[PDB]
Amino acid sequence: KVFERCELARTLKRLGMDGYRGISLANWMCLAKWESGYNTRATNYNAGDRSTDYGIFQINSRYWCNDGKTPGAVNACHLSCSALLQDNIADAVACAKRVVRDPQGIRAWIAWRNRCQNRDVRQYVQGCGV
């Protein structure tokens, strides 16, 4: 499923993301935007370390979800990576929350640093009623 901007904003808000561990909705929207273009089926294989990024938040197989094919990987969100490829984002949201509970917080995603950190991310939630 490829979400439309405001549709995703409300979907994330209903799921408890607005201010989760101090992270605004606009930040989560900027993250999903640059990670997958709001596409729940987005995937990216990393040939160098044999891991894969799954879903709308592009969560990595090495530490967060299990796909059975990543060397010495763990499954911190205790989910099948397949759960991160559903149209329904509840599981991906729970896993995204699991990721930010770590010390780095939203900074866990280097793309957030590159395109969202210290940026005007207002435009992502404007007019979405959130």
> Is 7 considered catalytic here?
no
What separation in angstroms does the CA of 112 have from each of 29, 82, 117? 10, 23, 6
Torsion 98-37-123-107 (CA) sign: positive
Beta strands in 1-119 (DSSP E): 43-46, 51-54, 59-60
Length of the chain in terms of residues written: 130
Q: Tell me how far apart the alpha carbons of residues 127 and 39 are, in angstroms, rounded to a whole number.
A: 21
> Is 35 considered catalytic here?
yes
Domain hosting 79: range is 1-130
Resolution in A: 1.8
Q: Strand, coil or helix: what is 39?
A: strand
- CA 53 to chain centroid: 10
Angle at 78 (CA atoms; ends 74, 82), nearest 5 degrees: 95
Residue from 4, 7, 53, 102 carrying the catalytic annotation = 53
Q: Tell me how far apart the alpha carbons of residues 6 and 80 are, in angstroms, rounded to a whole number.
A: 28
CATH number, domain with residue 108: 1.10.530.10
Q: How many beta carbons lie within 10 A of that of residue 126, not counting itself?
A: 11
The count of domains in the chain is 1
Q: Tell me how far apart the alpha carbons of residues 84 and 126 are, in angstroms, rounded to a whole number.
A: 27
